[PDB]
Amino acid sequence: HHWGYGKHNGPEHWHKDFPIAKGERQSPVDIDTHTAKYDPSLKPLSVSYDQATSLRILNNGHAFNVEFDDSQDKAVLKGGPLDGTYRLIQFHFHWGSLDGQGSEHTVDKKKYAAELHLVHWNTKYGDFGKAVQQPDGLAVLGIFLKVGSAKPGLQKVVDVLDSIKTKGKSADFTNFDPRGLLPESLDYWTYPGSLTTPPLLECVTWIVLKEPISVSSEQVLKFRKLNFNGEGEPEELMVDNWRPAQPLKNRQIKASFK
Numbered sequence: 064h065h066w067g068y069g070k071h072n073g074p075e076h077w078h079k080d081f082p083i084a085k086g087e088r089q090s091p092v093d094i095d096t097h098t099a100k101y102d103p104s105l106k107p108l109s110v111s112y113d114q115a116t117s118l119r120i121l122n123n124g125h126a127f128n129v130e131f132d133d134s135q136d137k138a139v140l141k142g143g144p145l146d147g148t149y150r151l152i153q154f155h156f157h158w159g160s161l162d163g164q165g166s167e168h169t170v171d172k173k174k175y176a177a178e179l180h181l182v183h184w185n186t187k188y189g190d191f192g193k194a195v196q197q198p199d200g201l202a203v204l205g206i207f208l209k210v211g212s213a214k215p216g217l218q219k220v221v222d223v224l225d226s227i228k229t230k231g232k233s234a235d236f237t238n239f240d241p242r243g244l245l246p247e248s249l250d251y252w253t254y255p256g257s258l259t260t261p262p263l264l265e266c267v268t269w270i271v272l273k274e275p276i277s278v279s280s281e282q283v284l285k286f287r288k289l290n291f292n293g294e295g296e297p298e299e300l301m302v303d304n305w306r307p308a309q310p311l312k313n314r315q316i317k318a319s320f321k
């Protein structure tokens with residue numbers, strides 16, 4: 064009875080194995096633009112993916128992750144509200160059963176078709192495993208996906224999904240430049256949060272971009288062909304793998320714009 068997104072093992076059941084699910088710094092959250100606070104002291108975000116080195120893409124039964132080589136000071140996230148440097152280790156998405164839903168964070172209750180999470184760990188801590196044990200261990204860049212024109216930089220991902228349909232499958236995924244998944248503007252909202260999947264550790268400084276990237280209906284449709292199940296097991300399409308908004312509980316969401 065492993066955790067999942069079904070009615071029997073979904074978000075509403077997670078607290079039984081991970082009590083922190085009802086904690087004080089849980090993610091995602093709804094971004095109420097009227098209550099968010101513009102902070103003029105917030106510096107521009109610094110995303111350096113020029114030399115990021117992608118390795119493989121795999122279906123872990125919850126989503127698909129594109130992993131990178133984080134052994135060198137390659138892809139790093141810094142600046143913005145951060146006081147340290149974080150290395151990119153992997154990215155994945157969360158999406159729905161229809162274009163009307165799929166994102167984890169919402170803006171004034173609005174849900175996007177999907178949400179991209181670029182995960183980075185603090186260089187003060189040695190590696191990912193050690194970083195998640197600290198309150199400022201991770202910096203996750205969240206980017207909303209809306210339907211419209213195609214996103215060229217996403218095509219390589221879309222095209223390879225048919226080869227890793229079921230849990231446990233993976234494929235070579237070298238030479239992928241994540242710079243192709245970023246919107247033009249880097250304006251953002253930021254707040255202290257957690258991982259949105261178990262163990263739900265409250266070790267994340269969330270940075271959610273104001274500008275969503277546009278992907279075509281054809282592209283997002285491909286996400287919905289994946290399976291939660293492994294090969295040979297009953298079909299369980301991978302859709303609605305998103306955790307709903309959690310109580311802000313007085314944390315303050317700051318923005319780099321009004």
Ligand SMILES: [Zn+2]
Binds near residue numbers: 157180259
């Ligand atoms: Zn995520």
